[PDB]
């Protein structure tokens, strides 16, 4: 199914996932597209951070549902 990541400049990134997946895997794939490591990325659904570990399933994200990426860089 087809989710979109809305960007802080406002671009659309348009994903193919399952409701099985995980948040780790949905940042691997905005990895894939952008070359952002998962570590530096924050994903937001309707206000909540959502957890690496958890699922699509698990916070009732469904098909044409719209995330947020925030961007967290490590201190160098
Ligand atoms: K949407
Ligand atoms: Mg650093
Ligand atoms: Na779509
Ligand atoms: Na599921
Ligand atoms: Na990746
Ligand atoms: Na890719
Ligand atoms: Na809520
Ligand atoms: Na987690
Ligand atoms: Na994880
Ligand atoms: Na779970
Ligand atoms: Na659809
Ligand atoms: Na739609």
Do not use: C, W
Not at 40 to 59: C, N, V
């Amino acid at each position: 199914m087809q989710i979109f990541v809305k960007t802080l400049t406002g671009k659309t990134i348009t994903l193919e996932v399952e409701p099985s997946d995980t948040i780790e895997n949905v940042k691997a794939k905005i990895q894939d597209k952008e070359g952002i490591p998962p570590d530096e990325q924050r994903l937001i659904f309707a206000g909540k951070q959502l957890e690496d570990g958890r699922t699509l399933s698990d916070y009732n994200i469904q098909k044409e549902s719209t995330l947020h990426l925030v961007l967290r860089l490590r201190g160098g």
